[PDB]
């Protein structure tokens, strides 16, 4: 029983040769047993989906340009950090209802900046703008297009915007086989749960999506703001890591806020975004992968077993996958195959596919 | 800000 | 537990958003429940102060006849307009002898004079019902011919336009009504106190703008630490200066000092006797306040709700349940200090501590006992009302009785409740619970 190595291209270290060797011819005699060691290494970069939420209030006006930069710059950095990226975004002002807006004179419903003789867009709960896409150019163009609206009071409904950013997928366009990051902007205090009771809204924000066709938070005027708890539930359940990118004015408020939400971080949204981009790459440093193998196109008659040697260099029998691999680590698997006699087919072909790897070990087997 | 105004 | 007495309202009406008790000079006790979206005779949701008489079966209530027509009064080259469109006539109700004060926080109000106007801002307005005399007076201490430009020019000093006056309201034992408008002074908040007798005497039909001589509006402030706190979102009255000759005002602002939230104790003359600050940020420390002698030593103690409080538990998890802060008044002329006791809910996302109902004493003994709300508590996530059997030392962390929502999802059962009032005169307070989402109110006649 000799196993001739056919395709043995070396592992890349970033062809993206993620499995070595690639093709093997296995020759067997009746009642035979034989073990060979394969090696596998992650090569290509990691997948990521960034959603971006922005204030649009009269207030936000002071730092509007600021938050716009925090979009585009961010994308650029994660273009240099990975190739498998998607980016999407949404905007928000406050609950569209008195006393948060101006309703007199009636023109205020179309322009609540009547007293300043200026034009501001009719203020809105949450208007989801761009679904997540690899088209970063379209994301940049749509982010820059957003402009300022008006409300009455200083706090704004950002938590409503985050809940509707994470709470639905099809509208927003996430990927199950990827990491998720959510960057939230503001410059003033945030309307939290129980703020909307000033406008007659006493029904909470639940864990369901209320955006349909019009690209608006339909149930904005009838659903209250969301609390930090349900925020955390929706961030964790969907595997979303939050970064509060806020102005230095009351950055302590959001540092305390981040202490209040497990796993989230806070950046000083300002003239620069170093404090936020460094935290982006920090969160990117913590992504751990898994190398798990399956075997396809093999009959039941042939029996198989294995050992495994991971990055820890500790040999384990019966464990086909270690938890928490990184980029560049090599894992070896010694597979033992036992054949019971010579079948009539006399020539088989099967695959060993690492889970989530398009590359596979194609094995041709002959019996003498 | 006291209201939606620039500080 | 069978006598879960149901009071019904029409669809849309939000029957139960606010509630209180009334005892006319005739002596008939009625549940006054405000449905802020009741359909008027003009097929418009404005508000309805359902004077529900105490009926075992409950059901639809006789909508007490409040003037729903908008007054386009003319005086001094000005037009006083009281926009009652979506006014919420019923988002806060109180009573005192044969007087019912039923306040529309969203009763928009305006002055048309040349091009300028007062802006239809939810100044609020308490309708004064004297049903025995049939006197339909009106009160709005916040109602003001002051133009928008005048308010802007003075850095919004005393900017009362957005009062939502009658957002909360209490009646002083002496007979003067104190209304808490969190929207006061540009959402800073304020208290406006005036006798009911004086406003009744000063009332004239179709005037809607008249200075009341005995009104007492709160002093505004300029320290940013009070900004957007909603200094008045919750209001109550207790004695904290140890001087029974004056009445002390306890104000809960749940967003005080950047979402920390506080409760201030002031004298009758609107001067700070003390301030008590929030432990956990964004927990809404001051959403609901409650003044009572939980200790029962003769000195009033303060109870604050924090319905967005999140605790730390095993595996280092921050689970959002809520909290109740109890501050105890020290013996003699001593100021209140650190949170005397701390009480916490169990169910996740329950908004535990949204509404606190002073229950007085449950077992008719002497330990002051209270109740607290959790509109989305319980295993199901529908509603929860938790009875805190208080102690001579303070408040126990394990609620004695938990009432679950018999309504479906979205009802916000327990969101506004009230006790301390005996309906059947059995000698025990009766807990009335305003499940607004289902347009119903549940009265539980608590047997100890
Ligand atoms: C109170 O609660 C809610 C809040 O308003 C109400 O819910 C809405 O009520 C309207 C009633 O006008 C309802 O419209 C009905 O739709 C039916 C079709 O599903 C209509 O046809 C009926 O179909 C029956 C099934 O075959 C048939 O047997 C019957 O003869 C009739 O033809 C019906 O006539 C109504 O127009 C809305 O669907 C409903 N919407 C929601 C979102 O709830 C509720 O009705 C109110 N209940 C009461 C008792 O007042
Ligand atoms: C959220 O961020 C804020 C800043 O934005 C952090 O505020 C910090 O709060 C601490 C106190 O928790 C401050 O330390 C001291 O505070 C006292 C004032 O409080 C005292 O209170 C007791 C009773 O509670 C009274 O008896 C005293 O008289 C007194 O009033 C002050 O006197 C000290 O000099 C000292 O400042 C700290 O200063 C403050 N930091 C800033 C930058 O303002 C807050 O910690 C943070 N939240 C959490 C949970 O960390
Ligand atoms: C991979 O591990 C398996 C067992 O999981 C190895 O089989 C062992 O071979 C040795 C002889 O060298 C025997 O003494 C053991 O009894 C066998 N199995 C076990 C687990 O005890 C197999 O040989 C390993 N492959 C390599 C590369 O050595
Ligand atoms: C194969 O298995 C034998 C025992 O079964 C072991 O001694 C040897 O180290 C293994 N590896 C190879 C590929 O020979
Ligand atoms: C209480 O106030 C009244 C009203 O002025 C006063 O006449 C009375 O003397 C006061 N009583 C005490 C004990 O101070
Ligand atoms: Ca700004
Ligand atoms: Ca606002
Ligand atoms: Ca006093
Ligand atoms: Ca006491
Ligand atoms: Ca007792
Ligand atoms: Ca009773
Ligand atoms: Mg703003």
Author numbering:
A (entry chain B): 59 to 72, 79 to 432
B (entry chain C): 1 to 7
C (entry chain A): 5 to 452
Give the original sentences from the paper that presented this experimental model.
Platelet integrin αIIbβ3 is maintained in a bent inactive state (low affinity to physiologic ligand), but can rapidly switch to a ligand-competent (high-affinity) state in response to intracellular signals (“inside-out” activation). Integrins are αβ heterodimeric receptors participating in cell–cell and cell–matrix adhesion in metazoa. The integrin ligand-binding site comprises an “Arg” pocket at the top of the propeller domain and a metal-ion-dependent-adhesion-site (MIDAS), normally occupied by proadhesive Mg2+ ion in the βA domain, flanked by two regulatory metal binding sites a ligand-associated metal binding site (LIMBS or SyMBS) and an adjacent to MIDAS (ADMIDAS), each normally occupied by a Ca2+ ion7,8.
Full-length αIIbβ3 bound to the partial agonist drug eptifibatide undergoes dramatic conformational changes in the integrin that may contribute to the increased bleeding seen in treated patients. A third finding revealed in the eptifibatide-bound structure is the large conformational changes in the full-length αIIbβ3 induced by this ligand-mimetic drug. Surprisingly, only the headpiece without the thigh domain was visible in the cryo-EM map of the full-length αIIbβ3-eptifibatide complex, despite the lack of evidence for proteolytic degradation. The absence of additional features corresponding to the leg domains is thus most likely due to drug-induced conformational flexibility. Eptifibatide’s homoarginine (HRG) makes a salt bridge (red dotted line) with the propeller’s D224, and its Asp (D) monodentately coordinates (red dotted line) the Mg2+ ion (cyan sphere) at MIDAS. The present structure also indicates that the αIIbβ3 TM and CT domains do not limit the global conformational changes induced by eptifibatide and presumably by other partial agonist drugs. The magnitude of these conformational changes makes it less likely that a complete switch of the integrin back to the ligand-competent or inactive state is achievable when the drug disengages from the integrin.
